[PDB]
Write a protein that binds this ligand. Structure first.
Ligand code: NAD
Ligand code: NAD
Ligand code: CA
Ligand code: CA
Lengths: 411, 410
């Protein structure tokens, strides 16, 4: 028992504002002492994404697909406002959207529950993991206003040169609005792969929601694919594990979700993902207890982070010079969740267990009362919380450290 | 003991299976004792709908227009197995379907809340009234699979001969899928009118939710036509009553809805309303604690029912002679909401007083501790619920009957 390590490689992406300052402590205090895995490092501080024309970003994305596991701190996705603050060049796109794209596959959000920390939905006793397809659909579609009377028609035009296929969609007598969207069989099939794979690892059952009732052909295509794919390559594997796949009309699924105790992976389409994920986020409690994880369709490759932002407001009090109480846990979990993936590919039970023992030690700490402002507010309530109801970011980490070292001995 | 009577008229639409049995009970015990109402009765039982050949259903809908208010008992929609059981001549369309067509307007699901009945969401203290926009987004869209590589295009082809405008949406390479969809300015302008009408009438605020961050023109047109109407007709009136309107990203609204004490109307688009309504209504408890209410855009014609069906599972036990404990408040509250409209239109304040007392007393009765089998299940278990904890349908109604008199004190 000293420093244990493992000979694959983590790929660290460094990120900015408050999350950045926590990254730096997490590492020093809770991971580097007891683990020394070799690390290809990158630095996606917006500081540097302007200094490198958003090109450490794309370097780092492929950096992961090579090595198989990544940790990302949260980063600033530029608004137009953001440009004036730091620096000009292009008002850049979101690193998350870039890496997600380069790696293929799908992001899965996971709450982290404690017993003293209540939820808003009384029935939820277990984690509901939403996985979001994040491509096509309403998000890359053409929209338009209609001011004349006229027709809105659609044309499919064969590439080989066959019959344009034409559909009268509607004839406007006054004014209105109009829109078209696509999706591709490849992006869906990859969503499906990534999902089936994700539920299978974590030993949970799997729902996908559509509205094929209404959209017989478009939503059907999704249903029909997961149906196609489940029975080809996974059903047998599911039964062996003892889990399942089912499909639901979205309206069931949200009823089910609400009324069910939890413990499942929920495939959502791109818009159902944006919409539901905010509900869960608020509902489970603090966004500071949630981890995004990015899985590839081959299942063998991953990039995990927190599911919150950089915490700008807190960062401002860091600069003011003031004390702060940011939840480092999603971020700490980020590390453990990753490291645990690197452990299960290296056949490494020393590190694997340390990732369990740290996650257990964090939960047992919160459950014994030592927690942060945000979680104090989950138990008590925003207006009714006071200083000696929580710890600052520093004290939490040094509280979980000391608790950790004692449980490292007794074994 | 004078008994309140009325001046204008009220349309009773009568229903099917268990709720028809409960409907009769409420007029016998809770209504015709305490108030006299000129009623136009149309019976919309499945049998009668068959005999007349859906003729009464239409008959009834026009009546509502003429008079300005409808109360509706739950009615069976004809599907396959229903034609065999009922020996139907022709699988008649849904009656609400038929009715909502003729009247027009927008439905609002309002839930009934009781101190002692916990919700699934801890933060909810007051109602959250979703208004869904029926007219098709997705629900009137065209969709088809792409097999060949090729190109999805869109044309707007002006009816005045002018030069069309194309839009290349996508070039497929493998196969995929394509959808095109629409909405009218007028359909949205009537969704709006109705929501503003409703929110003012209730004295609640109104959130409109859309995704105009992405659908800048499409979901834009919703945001726009609302605020056009807001600060032309309604902003003076809402501020007087101490309410407001505001737009929000659909992302806010679900998160707000969750964090929020509540007490507002939420208008949302067809799809956004369909999906939420079914989690929302699960969160609040039994289905017997919610009312539906169509309100046309002027705000003068209205038609109100329970937000639940005919509860057939229990109608089989009523047939067999076993005790039943269907919950009646939704059904009752359809009567009180409908009369409450009838009353507000007749500037008729003695009836308005009744509609209030009955609503308040029904809550009192449950709050106190007499309830139906669902509400004991909410409070106590599913297990650990014994017979002393719930009244049967009849003996519950008759339990508020008493307490109504006890508070028939003005
Ligand atoms: N990489 C990512 O996961 C990600 C996701 C969304 C937004 N962002 C970015 O984050 C920045 C800030 O945006 P935001 O307003 O959504 O902020 P945020 O998501 O960091 O936090 C939202 C609010 O919730 C609270 N909160 C969230 N996480 C917390 C934690 N761990 N501990 C304590 N409190 C917490 C904060 O008080 C904050 O005001 C933006 O520049 C945006 O581009 C990043
Ligand atoms: N007129 C309408 O607005 C309307 C709406 C929905 C369904 N229906 C009709 O009713 C029939 C059956 O519908 P369904 O069974 O799908 O839904 P339902 O509302 O009849 O009942 C479904 C379940 O909900 C429960 N439920 C509903 N109201 C209840 C109450 N007051 N107390 C206790 N439990 C209650 C029942 O226990 C039942 O198991 C169908 O033939 C349909 O056409 C009519
Ligand atoms: Ca969102
Ligand atoms: Ca629904």
């Amino acid at each position: 028992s000293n420093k244990i390590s493992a000979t694959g490689v983590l790929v660290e992406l460094d990120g900015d504002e408050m999350t950045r300052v926590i990254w730096k402590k997490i590492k020093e205090t809770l991971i580097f002492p007891f683990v020394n895995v070799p690390i290809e490092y990158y630095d996606l501080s917006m500081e540097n994404r302007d200094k490198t024309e958003d090109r450490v970003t794309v370097e780092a994305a492929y950096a992961i697909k090579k090595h198989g596991v990544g940790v990302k701190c949260a980063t600033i996705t530029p608004d137009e406002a953001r440009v004036k603050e730091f620096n000009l060049k292009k008002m850049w796109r979101s690193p998350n959207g870039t890496i997600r794209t380069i790696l293929g596959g799908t992001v899965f959000r996971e709450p982290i529950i404690c017993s003293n920390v209540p939820r808003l939905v009384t029935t939820w006793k277990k984690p509901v993991v939403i996985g979001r397809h994040a491509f096509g659909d309403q998000y890359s579609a053409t929209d338009a206003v209609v001011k004349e009377p006229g027709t809105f028609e659609m044309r499919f035009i064969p590439a080989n040169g066959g019959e344009p296929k034409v559909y009268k969609v509607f004839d406007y007598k006054s004014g209105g609005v109009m829109m078209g969207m696509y999706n591709t069989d490849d992006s869906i099939r990859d969503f499906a792969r990534s999902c089936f794979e994700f539920a299978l690892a974590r030993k949970w059952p799997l729902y996908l929601s559509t509205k094929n009732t209404i959209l017989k052909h478009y939503d059907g295509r999704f249903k029909d694919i997961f149906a196609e794919m489940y029975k080809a390559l996974y059903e047998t594997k599911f039964k062996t594990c003892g889990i399942f796949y089912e499909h639901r009309l979205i309206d069931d699924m949200v009823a089910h979700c609400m009324r069910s105790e939890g413990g499942y992976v929920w495939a959502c389409k791109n818009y159902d993902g944006d919409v539901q994920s905010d509900s869960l986020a608020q509902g489970f409690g603090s966004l500071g207890m949630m981890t995004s994880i990015l899985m590839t369709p081959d299942g063998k490759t991953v990039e995990v982070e927190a599911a919150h932002g950089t915490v700008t407001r807190h960062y401002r009090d860091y600069q003011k010079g003031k004390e702060t109480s940011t939840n480092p846990v999603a971020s700490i979990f980020a590390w453990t969740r990753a490291l645990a993936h690197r452990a299960r590919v290296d056949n490494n039970n020393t590190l694997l267990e340390f990732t369990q023992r740290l996650e257990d030690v964090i939960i047992a700490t919160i459950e014994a009362g030592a927690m942060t402002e945000d979680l104090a507010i989950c138990i008590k309530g925003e207006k009714n919380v006071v200083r000696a109801d929580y710890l600052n970011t520093d004290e939490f980490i040094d509280a979980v450290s000391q608790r950790l070292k004692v449980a490292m001995q007794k074994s």
